[PDB]
């Protein structure tokens, strides 16, 4: 007949877990119940969220299996459920304190410290230039340093960086939110 409004869940920098589902599409808007359980660990239980959802770091286990489900009170028979690789859906905070420093007269290096995770993240940088129609991309390895080989004096560049939980400890595809745009003068 009708499908449930579904849900995407993203772990934010391994601080708390947030699942957001839009109840606007269905008639008679309702904030349905949410559940969760960790299959991987032995001696496990089915828990109720009751924090409308949100889960604290006390109940987040990575590198392992996690299952989410949504239940509506009117029709208990009908529900939803998904199987999630929690290391495939980590969306950390946008990196803070995007430090720029200038090693040589014609090349640049970029540094940024993520909030919690260091050794399991890949990065992307987009830089532009004066009058540029487009934006030039470049990927970075698990190390958090990117180098721009060619720069110009009078021209000015805009850098925005988003990290990604890939590939050493997962295969997350979605990118982080754009950080505060650090501007070169």
């Amino acid at each position, epitope marked *: 007949t009708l499908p449930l409004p579904e849900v995407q869940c993203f772990v934010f920098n391994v601080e708390y877990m947030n699942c957001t589902w839009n109840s606007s599409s269905e008639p008679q808007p309702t904030n349905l119940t949410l559940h969760y359980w960790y299959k991987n660990s032995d001696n496990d239980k089915v828990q109720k969220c009751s924090h409308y959802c949100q889960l604290q770091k006390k109940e987040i286990h990575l590198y392992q299996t996690f299952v989410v489900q949504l239940q509506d009170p009117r029709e208990p028979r009908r529900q939803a459920t998904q199987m999630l690789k929690l290391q495939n859906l980590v969306i950390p905070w946008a990196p803070e304190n995007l430090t720029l420093h200038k090693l040589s007269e014609s090349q640049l290096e970029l540094n940024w410290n993520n909030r919690f995770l260091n050794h399991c993240l890949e990065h992307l940088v987009q830089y532009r230039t004066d*009058w*540029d129609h487009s934006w030039t991309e470049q990927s970075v390895d698990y190390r958090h340093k990117f180098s721009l080989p060619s720069v110009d004096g009078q021209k000015r560049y805009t850098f925005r960086v988003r990290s990604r939980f890939n590939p050493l400890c997962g295969s997350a595809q979605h990118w982080s939110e754009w950080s505060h745009p650090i501007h070169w003068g």
Partner: antibody, heavy 120, light 107 residues
Framework: VQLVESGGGVVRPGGSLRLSCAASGFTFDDFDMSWVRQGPGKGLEWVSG????????GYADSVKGRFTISRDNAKNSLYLQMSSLRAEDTALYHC???????????????WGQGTLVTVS | DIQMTQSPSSLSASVGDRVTMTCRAS??????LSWYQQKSGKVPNLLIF???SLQSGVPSRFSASGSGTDFTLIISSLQPEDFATYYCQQSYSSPLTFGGGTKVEIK
């Protein structure tokens, strides 16, 4: 590639009115917005602008203390709500793709039409 | 702030003439100044790119030079669709400002 705004009406001095414009066919986060006005007697004039992140709002000489631009990338729209107006604010308002306030990536501009607002 | 005076406002020329026109700026700008074209009753459009280059979709007939303080524009082999206002504009230091206005006559 189009820019469409909403609004209309008249108000005596000291009133308020919201002007919201949205972009279609664009990557909103990639480039920033601006505002340009024209009174029938004179030429174009710039109002204000930001840097696609709501962090470097720009001012003008005369409209500095009234209101300054707001943006919502998630909703993909831009807002300018005037209040405490004056008789010399009767003009036609356009919100324009492009512009720049902070340094770097000054992308020029692409105009997007507008409508008229008047106050006594 | 930054003030732009687009002068002269009144010009005298006919089809196929060689007269460049200038723009002036109150404060110095290196190469941050574009140009526009305003035929009566329609939205302006971009005509000169950042400093001296040209946007695509435009005939190569229009030309510009003198980047810096006194930008200048020049057009050759005038057509019946080129008489308008130019409105030199800068995007160097906020707030942005436009020029005065130049009007060209038909004979």
């Amino acid at each position: 590639v189009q820019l469409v705004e909403s609004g209309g009406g008249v108000v005596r001095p000291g009133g308020s009115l919201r002007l919201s414009c949205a972009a279609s066919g664009f990557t909103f986060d990639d480039f920033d917005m601006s505002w340009v006005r024209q009174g029938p007697g004179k030429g174009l004039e710039w109002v204000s602008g930001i840097n696609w992140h709501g962090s470097s709002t720009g001012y003008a000489d005369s409209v500095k203390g009234r209101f300054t631009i707001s943006r919502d990338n998630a909703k993909n729209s831009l807002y300018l709500q005037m209040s405490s107006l004056r008789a010399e604010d009767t003009a036609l308002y356009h919100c324009v793709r492009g512009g720049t306030i902070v340094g770097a990536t000054t992308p020029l501009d692409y105009w997007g039409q507008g409508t008229l607002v008047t106050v006594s | 702030d930054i003030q732009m005076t687009q002068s002269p406002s009144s010009l005298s020329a006919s089809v196929g003439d060689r007269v460049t026109m200038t723009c002036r700026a109150s404060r110095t700008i290196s190469s941050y100044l574009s140009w526009y074209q305003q035929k009566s009753g329609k939205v302006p459009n971009l005509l000169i790119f950042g400093a001296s280059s040209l946007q695509s979709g435009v005939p190569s007939r229009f030309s510009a030079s003198g980047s810096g303080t006194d930008f200048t524009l020049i057009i050759s082999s005038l057509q019946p669709e080129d008489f308008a206002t130019y409105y030199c504009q800068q995007s160097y230091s906020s707030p942005l400002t436009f020029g005065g206005g130049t009007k060209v006559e038909i004979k």
